[PDB]
């Protein structure tokens, strides 16, 4: 029921998720608690956690693919900028959040959307893997 | 007295910061407006903005020291976690957010410490800098 165990269905493939990247190291699909619409985690496919600790060349890839989301989710819905977290403290398996930005009280846990609707999500899916195609 | 002007004054010594890393490419100093004690922003020297379309070569320095001040921040302040973020809306010049975290609730800007007292600035800065000796 937890953050954290939908998180692991959701990587390993026992619950459904909406993905919009995927690489020999590194996957990204939508969160099911967004602070605006497009919020993908990024997230190395190896159990890793504690990003200050974690191998540069580890992070580093990891960073590299959450640039390529952050210019797909300001183009994909027409923000000039992108927000970028990692926390941890929900889930302990490293992840960073992107996420087109519009404001500084964008940024935070508060007021994530709990309940975002199925056709918002497919929709940021969408656009992002639009994005995406556009970018390569 | 905006956050862009006063970061830049800090960056160019023209008001007084508190620096606790320099090297040929990236600075490190204390911010004026905590979200926790030991709050600290991560620069490169170059005028570059815009996270997400940073070149590979930048961004990885700066990838690179966020994760030394993360490592410095947790060992200083004793947390198992550090918070990192990226948001750009106040200041122009791109720089990562990095701090020890306890709570979700630490994220964002909604309330930082907008003047946080002298001893509390001299006590991070000190900390975070034996810990990077610690950790050199």
New interface residues.
């Given amino acids: 029921g937890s953050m954290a165990s939908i998180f692991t269905k959701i990587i390993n493939r026992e619950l459904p998720g909406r993905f919009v990247y995927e690489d020999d190291d590194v996957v990204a699909f939508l969160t099911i608690e967004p602070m605006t619409q497009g919020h993908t985690l990024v997230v190395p496919r190896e159990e890793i956690d ?5 191998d ?1 060349a580890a ?2 890839r990891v ?2 693919v ?6 797909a989710v ?1 183009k994909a819905f027409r923000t000039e ?10 889930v302990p398996h490293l992840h960073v959040h992107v996420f087109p ?1 519009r ?3 964008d ?4 007021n994530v959307d709990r309940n975002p609707s199925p056709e918002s999500l497919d929709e940021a899916q969408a656009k992002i893997k639009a994005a995406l195609a556009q970018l390569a």
Avoid at 66 to 71: E, F, H, N, R, V
Avoid at 107 to 110: D, K, N
């Fill in positions: 504690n990003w200050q600790d974690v540069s992070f580093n960073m590299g959450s640039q390529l989301i952050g210019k300001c900028r992108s927000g970028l977290i990692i926390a941890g403290l929900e930005t404001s500084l009280s940024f935070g846990f508060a």
